[PDB]
Amino acid sequence: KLPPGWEKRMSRSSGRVYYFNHITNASQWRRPSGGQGEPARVRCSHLLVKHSQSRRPSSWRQEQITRTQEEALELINGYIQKIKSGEEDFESLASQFSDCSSAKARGDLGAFSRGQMQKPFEDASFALRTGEMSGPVFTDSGIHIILRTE
């Protein structure tokens, strides 16, 4: 009925219905749809927020990442909120705040196939449809927001 990963959920805090993708961790009020499988290749941009437990706790933004995983998640959630509100743009935020060297490419990672990225990153990327944005995606590098561009 719903595309891969998508399920109809509701808030324990409130009670309002929404839609959640358990592969990309994306959430949205809009129903995600009104033998195709996955695309064989995708192109994605991403915004990475590292933390003290990241595999390399350093980046061009600071040689010593000291924020906790929770503080990194709170930053990721804030960036998602700014993008969804329209106040900020994904590429603009990735250029300024991504702890990945791809920030110089506005977050662009180019095209990739299965078996080339970290498994949680890969699973989310191939579950996004073109133009869709993930929720928080947890890898050994940190927490990502992923935007599928092709």
């Binding site: 595999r55 390399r56 990945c100 060297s101 078996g115 080339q116 970290q118 890898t139 590098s141």
Partner: peptide, 4 residues
Amino acid sequence: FXWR
């Protein structure tokens, strides 16, 4: 960095 990612990549596997």
